[PDB]
Amino acid sequence: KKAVINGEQIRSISDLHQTLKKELALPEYYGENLDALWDALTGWVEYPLVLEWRQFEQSKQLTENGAESVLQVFREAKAEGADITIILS
């Protein structure tokens, strides 16, 4: 329903997927990768969903293009029809 990401606390691409695993109540088998995220956002997660990504820039640093690629999946899922609200702060 509601998911929060505290950017300043993300040290790796791993921290991010695991933070998402918890914040979105993903399946234990969650693949912790872009494809697994997409499949979870469109065949598992509950809606409506509100994702609040704080300190995005900071988290972008310690993850390379990872954060941006994760954000992209959320954006496409939304364009796909998923009721997702993204708050980039």
């Binding site: 399946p27 088998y29 969650y30 693949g31 912790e32 990768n33 872009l34 494809d35 697994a36 997409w38 499949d39 469109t42 065949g43 598992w44 997660v45 509950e46 809606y47 690629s69 999946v73 029809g81």
Partner: protein, 110 residues
């Protein structure tokens, strides 16, 4: 009406008929029938059905890409309840891969 949802049964079917078995429906269709993923009610609203056929964007690039080639995926071994971590991956030129660890790793089967 005899469901085909195993890795080999589906692969054989994709290669022999170039389409998924009849027991498959896309996410949009399932939803059109009242499916709600978070409820894990697919079997309730669509008995004997499994999600399959949607375009697969191969976002990690682990599957072999090629201009003109589009990938699609389908659920394998699914019966009822919440979706598992098994998928079959097939290309427009009929290459077949599979994953059992939620898209972490893949194995070419055809």
């Amino acid at each position: 009406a005899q469901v085909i949802n195993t890795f080999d049964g589906v692969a054989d079917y994709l290669q022999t008929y170039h389409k998924l078995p009849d027991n498959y429906i896309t996410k949009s269709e399932a939803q059109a029938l009242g499916w709600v993923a978070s409820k894990g009610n697919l079997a309730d609203v669509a008995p004997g059905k499994s999600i399959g056929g949607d375009i697969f964007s191969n976002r990690e690039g682990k599957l072999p890409g090629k201009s003109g080639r589009t990938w699609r995926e389908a659920d394998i071994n699914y019966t009822s309840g919440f979706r598992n971590s098994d998928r079959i991956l097939y290309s427009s030129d009929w290459l077949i891969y599979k994953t059992t660890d939620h898209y972490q790793t893949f194995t070419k089967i055809r």
